[PDB]
């Protein structure tokens, strides 16, 4: 024996992307080459987000993609999103900014072309910025998923606010013993 | 779209004999039997191959035209060289070196032409 320490061989990581998409594999090859040949930590993080799963890449939204560029210092910069930018029903005005994302929805592309912006793809983003200069990388609302609101220490023991599983959100379904003080105990 | 064609053809083709050993292409226009990307005769816009002559004497060279794609009746232009092995080896050397046409696979074309001349002369 040599190592008294525990054998934790592989750390956590996903090396190759599990998606068999050919275009995604070509983007993985190109940004892997840029990440190991340009000394660009932006290319490192974009290559890791291409390694990242379909679920852990949440869809970006048009209002958030406006508001992250409305801040001072993001006028002439391009919005790089590893993920999808979708339509928003809320906003009315769209600025003259640039988009660099994968699989933008049709209404979003139509409204950006009406507003006068320019959408790109990752190969054009690489040809325009190998190191990734003039770019801002964005991510979407992971924790706002319906799945993540069931996750906690319990559904109700320090009242715990974490949404127990039930069929119908209403009367007669999980509302009596532990939900009110008149019927037994209360949390 | 050569990389798309490679990422499709590199599996699930009517080639790629994965039978008890490594991958062989057998690839009716090819220079090395290894099913690789740098040695491929169907996918690239510029391809070189050598084949034996139908008469039995000489080596024929099949090179891709590049003046027109998606038209396989004229996409491959052929020549029939019947020389005394050094004149034709120098001919394919000057044809690959003096042109821009495929600076790669020089030694692939040269080794296959030389091996088929050794297999052809007796």
């Amino acid at each position: 024996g040599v190592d008294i320490r525990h054998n934790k061989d592989r750390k956590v990581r996903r090396k190759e992307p599990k998606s068999q998409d050919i275009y995604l594999r070509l983007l993985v090859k190109l940004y892997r080459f840029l990440a190991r040949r340009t000394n660009s930590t932006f290319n490192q993080v974009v290559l890791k987000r291409l390694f990242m799963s379909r679920t852990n890449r949440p869809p970006l939204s048009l209002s958030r993609m406006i508001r992250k560029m409305k801040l001072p210092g993001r006028e002439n910069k391009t919005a790089v999103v590893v993920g999808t930018i979708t339509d928003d029903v809320r906003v009315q005005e769209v600025p003259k900014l640039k988009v660099c994302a994968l699989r933008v929805t049709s209404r979003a592309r139509s409204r950006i072309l009406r507003a006068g912006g320019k959408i790109l793809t990752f190969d054009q983003l690489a040809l325009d910025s190998p190191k990734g200069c003039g770019t801002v990388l964005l991510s979407g609302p992971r924790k706002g998923r319906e799945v993540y609101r069931h996750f906690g220490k319990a559904p109700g023991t320090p009242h715990s606010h974490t949404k127990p599983y039930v069929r119908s959100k209403g009367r007669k379904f999980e509302r009596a013993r532990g939900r009110r003080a008149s019927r037994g105990y209360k949390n | 779209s050569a990389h798309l064609q490679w990422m499709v053809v590199r599996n699930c083709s009517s080639f790629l004999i994965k039978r008890n050993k490594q991958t062989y292409s057998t690839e009716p226009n090819n220079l090395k039997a290894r099913n690789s990307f740098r040695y491929n005769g169907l996918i690239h816009r510029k391809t070189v191959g050598v084949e034996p002559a139908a008469d039995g004497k000489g080596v024929v060279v099949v090179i891709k035209r590049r003046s027109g794609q998606r038209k396989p009746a004229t996409s491959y232009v052929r020549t029939t060289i019947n020389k005394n092995a050094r004149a034709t080896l120098s001919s394919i050397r000057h044809m690959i070196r003096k042109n821009k046409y495929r600076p790669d696979l020089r030694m692939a074309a040269i080794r296959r032409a030389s091996a088929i001349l050794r297999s052809q002369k007796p």
Binding site: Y23, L26, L27, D123, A126, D128, P130 | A2
Partner: protein, 52 residues
Amino acid sequence: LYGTWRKAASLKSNYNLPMHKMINTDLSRILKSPEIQRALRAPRKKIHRRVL
């Protein structure tokens, strides 16, 4: 029956052509373009094997 990316399909009611992921997808052309090769480190082909 399917259309181009400018217009919709006139026979199918709610169909459009798919989004094109990589527009100009020649990877050899991209990696041999001068815009990419302007920002490369150095060709490092040393091996640095095991020294007894």
